[PDB]
Amino acid sequence: MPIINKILVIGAGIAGPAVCYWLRRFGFSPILVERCANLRKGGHAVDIRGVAIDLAKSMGIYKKICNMRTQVELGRYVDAEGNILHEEKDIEILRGDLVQILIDAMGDVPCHFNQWVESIKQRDNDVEVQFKDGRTELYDLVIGADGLHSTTRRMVFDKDEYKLTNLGAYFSAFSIPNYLNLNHTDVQFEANQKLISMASDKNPKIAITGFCFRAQNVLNNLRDENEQRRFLRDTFQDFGWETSKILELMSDSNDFYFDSFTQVKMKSWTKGRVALVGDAGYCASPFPGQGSNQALVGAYIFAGELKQAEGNYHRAFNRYNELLQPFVEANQKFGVLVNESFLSKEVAEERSNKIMQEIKIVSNMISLPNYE
Ligand SMILES: Cc1cc2nc3c(=O)[nH]c(=O)nc-3n(C[C@H](O)[C@H](O)[C@H](O)COP(=O)(O)OP(=O)(O)OC[C@H]3O[C@@H](n4cnc5c(N)ncnc54)[C@H](O)[C@@H]3O)c2cc1C
């Protein structure tokens, strides 16, 4: 039936650039748009596991990813005065490095920045997208790759067609000058169900920080970056160790990110000519560390099923939904299990090791169909 070619992909994270790669490789014409003025490369290291590694090999990015893998030599745990409590010592790679690798591998896929989708209107034979500058454009399909808080999901699906479950924890990531001269070293301070960390590895001039904490009934409006910064500053006031200096340097950080630990549950990730890929449809929260693997696997399956459906997008979408659902369900379950213990050392480590082993295993329990 009618050929599908022109496809809008909204968001340039992991899922968006990955699905553009596979759509273009399989003979479609994806167009990538991003709301931010440039690529957002902030964020902590991610773990590429299992069949996603085979995808990286097929994508010709495996060697690049191995070359960019994290080299941290020393984990260090300290108390509020900086006394050392303890020291320690699939691919782990900084999120931004993976984003750039995927963008680079994309080839000739137009990538547009500072783009604001206002509305998405499904018509008989296409989807009409209006942008906040008044422009209207037509696409055969539209893909939300826009993350946990997906604008696309909100425009396309009714509120009773998705459920966000906030698990009661929040995290932040941002970069600062490496003022403690950490050398391939990660330092972490934990107290009172809060956590702060700082690590310098890839770049000796820069340290990436992270914050983790639990909160309930948040009064603040956390959709705004300034309110996020404010809530973080207020939560960690008087926390100890290096928190004060880190929060001071945060004012000049250009890669700030803040979010909740939240799972997205939907009976379907697709509606008509619209599909969600990655956190937009299936976020499992950071707890199991599967966000990137889900994005990479979902991208491949989405594009493959579309290729084989030869115009029948509803059939492709149904198979996409069905084939990825078991992996997502497993990941979300493991996320909830991790939640139950997050914020004796031996018991805790033993329980954590079992879950991580099981996460590693299910990452290898996906069949990747042959689309070529
Ligand atoms: C800057 C950044 C930092 C992150 N840091 C961490 C971290 O440290 N730890 C962690 O566990 N997870 C982090 N995440 C989430 C993590 O990347 C995801 O869990 C997953 O790995 C990949 O999901 P995704 O590609 O579907 O969505 P995301 O990586 O969230 O990417 C979404 C992309 O869509 C863009 N976007 C959003 N709305 C619109 C719109 N209306 N129009 C166009 N584009 C839009 C975003 O700006 C972003 O580039 C981060 C996400 C971002 C964007």
Automatic annotation (TrEMBL):
Q: State whether keyword Amino-acid biosynthesis applies.
A: no
Entry superkingdom:
Bacteria
- The entry marks the following residues as binding FAD, namely 14-15, 40, 44, 95, 279
Which keywords are on file for this protein? FAD, Flavoprotein, Nucleotide-binding
Descriptive protein name: Tetracycline destructase Tet(51)
Could you read off the lineage of the organism from its UniProt record?
Bacteria, environmental samples
